[PDB]
Amino acid sequence: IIGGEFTTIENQPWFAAIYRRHRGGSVTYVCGGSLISPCWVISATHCFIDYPKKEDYIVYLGRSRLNSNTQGEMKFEVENLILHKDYSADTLAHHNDIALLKIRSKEGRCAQPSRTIQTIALPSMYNDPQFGTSCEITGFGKEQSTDYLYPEQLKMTVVKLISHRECQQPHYYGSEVTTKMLCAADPQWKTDSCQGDSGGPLVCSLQGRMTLTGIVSWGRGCALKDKPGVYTRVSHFLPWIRSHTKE
Numbered sequence: 001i002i003g004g005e006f007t008t009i010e011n012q013p014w015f016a017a018i019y020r021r022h023r024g025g026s027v028t029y030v031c032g033g034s035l036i037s038p039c040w041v042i043s044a045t046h047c048f049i050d051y052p053k054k055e056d057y058i059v060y061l062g063r064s065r066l067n068s069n070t071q072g073e074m075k076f077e078v079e080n081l082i083l084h085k086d087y088s089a090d091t092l093a094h095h096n097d098i099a100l101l102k103i104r105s106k107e108g109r110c111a112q113p114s115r116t117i118q119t120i121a122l123p124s125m126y127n128d129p130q131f132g133t134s135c136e137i138t139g140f141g142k143e144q145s146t147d148y149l150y151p152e153q154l155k156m157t158v159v160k161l162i163s164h165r166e167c168q169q170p171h172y173y174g175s176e177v178t179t180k181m182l183c184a185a186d187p188q189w190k191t192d193s194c195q196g197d198s199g200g201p202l203v204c205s206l207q208g209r210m211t212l213t214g215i216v217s218w219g220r221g222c223a224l225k226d227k228p229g230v231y232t233r234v235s236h237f238l239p240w241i242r243s244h245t246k247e
Contacts, residue, residue, distance in 0.1 A: 004157025032200025
């Protein structure tokens, strides 16, 4: 997250921190995700496509820090890693960038809700906030495009939804953005998602309900003029989500 503010997991208790174990034993951060039911985390396919083996991954819930344990956290293996079969790496602008992780602890259990671990509601189909609506994004991604390190503390910021009409302009993203995607940016371009934020939640309040409107997917650089962050439009994937969460 470029700009924005530090936070702790209490302020985004559905946030899932996803890591990969390397041959040699080293564990590195991969991407964010969101808990949508006790056994299911939703994220982005591009985070996993190069290493599709479920045994490679570790998922934490209730974690506020990147390389330190948070009191009360839960650790999970990935029982199933489900990538969207129509994924395409189309020059930055990934299509169908959505993935599901069925989580299971060493003891064979799913998530247990607490003050630091809670699910996020899915939207109604094709029901998204009006453009110009302020939404929030959360993650452990870079604080500056030029940084080498990721922040140790979780961050969040606010971005505004951008119409498909505005985002499809040639001076924005042209044909790279589809109706299954959502653009969001800051009016001053001063805050944004960045590398490492992929897979995490874009949350909007619709009708009083905090809703998983988007999943961090792609963008040209970070916090750059006329280059919004781009998000998978969750409300266009409900049948995919419902079928695969029975697996």
